[PDB]
């Protein structure tokens, strides 16, 4: 079933549009959302997302990225 | 110094097709708020707490326990409606 | 200025789904993008100063057809 993950990415040109675009485009993604006190984190929910392949992809195209959270969906 | 009754709610997005997480969490270093988000009650998440990954457990009233690195805590709260 | 926009898109495979979520998610002032519906064939976008006209126009150019189901504020 579904994993919830939170990613801090550096977003200062349009690294905000790039990070969301890249994350949104990844296999198995159900939702991407700007979260955290400063809207500097991306929370991703889905199935079969490799967090490390995703951190790596972001670092390559956008700039710095850091996995900060993994939570399984509680289904009951 | 830490009083959750005075902490503004975190920014969140509740995915439509998994259950709504019952708890707000709030991360402090030396009683300064660093971030906040949501997590399930009667559950567990893995969280980067400053330098270290922490396994954090939640009970049925959103009390969180975990091995926080010195100076840091993550504290829980029932979201409105749970 | 807080918007919800639900678009039905023709997404006939893994790639078209990816390309459409790429394009909605890249739009200025998007806060969140979610695949919605029992069949995951609708894109919910929430945000601020999103132009639904251009969003629809662009999708229509790139991935397949696109219909506006919902705009509410």
Numbering used by the authors:
A (entry chain B): 187 to 198, 200 to 263
B (entry chain C): 32 to 113
C (entry chain A): 187 to 259
What do the study's own words say?
The rice NLR receptor Pik-1 binds the Magnaporthe oryzae effector AVR-Pik through an integrated heavy metal-associated (HMA) domain. The sensor NLR Pik-1 contains an integrated HMA domain between the CC and NB-ARC domains. Direct binding of AVR-Pik to the HMA domain is required to activate Pik-mediated immunity. However, the stealthy alleles AVR-PikC and AVR-PikF avoid interaction with Pik-HMA and evade host defenses.
The Asp67 and Lys78 polymorphisms that distinguish AVR-PikC and AVR-PikF from AVR-PikE and AVR-PikA, respectively, are located at interface 2. By contrast, PikpSNK-EKE-HMA bound to both AVR-PikC and AVR-PikF with higher apparent affinity (larger %Rmax) than PikpNK-KE-HMA. By determining the crystal structures of the Pikp-HMASNK-EKE/AVR-PikC and Pikp-HMASNK-EKE/AVR-PikF complexes, we confirmed the formation of new contacts across the HMA/effector interface that likely account for the expanded recognition profile to AVR-PikC and AVR-PikF. Crystals were obtained in several conditions in the Morpheus screen (Molecular Dimensions), and X-ray diffraction data were collected at the Diamond Light Source (Oxford, UK) to a resolution of 2.15 Å (Pikp-HMANK-KE/AVR-PikC), 2.05 Å (Pikp-HMASNK-EKE/AVR-PikC), and 2.2 Å (Pikp-HMASNK-EKE/AVR-PikF). Interface analysis performed with qtPISA identified 15 hydrogen bonds and nine salt bridges between Pikp-HMASNK-EKE and AVR-PikC, and 16 hydrogen bonds and 11 salt bridges between Pikp-HMASNK-EKE and AVR-PikF, compared to the 12 hydrogen bonds and eight salt bridges mediating the interaction between Pikp-HMANK- KE and AVR-PikC. Inspection of the structures revealed that the side chain of Glu258 does indeed extend across the interface, forming direct hydrogen bonds with the backbone of the effectors. This single mutation also supports additional hydrogen bonds at the interface between AVR-PikC (or AVR-PikF) and residues comprising β4 of the HMA domain.
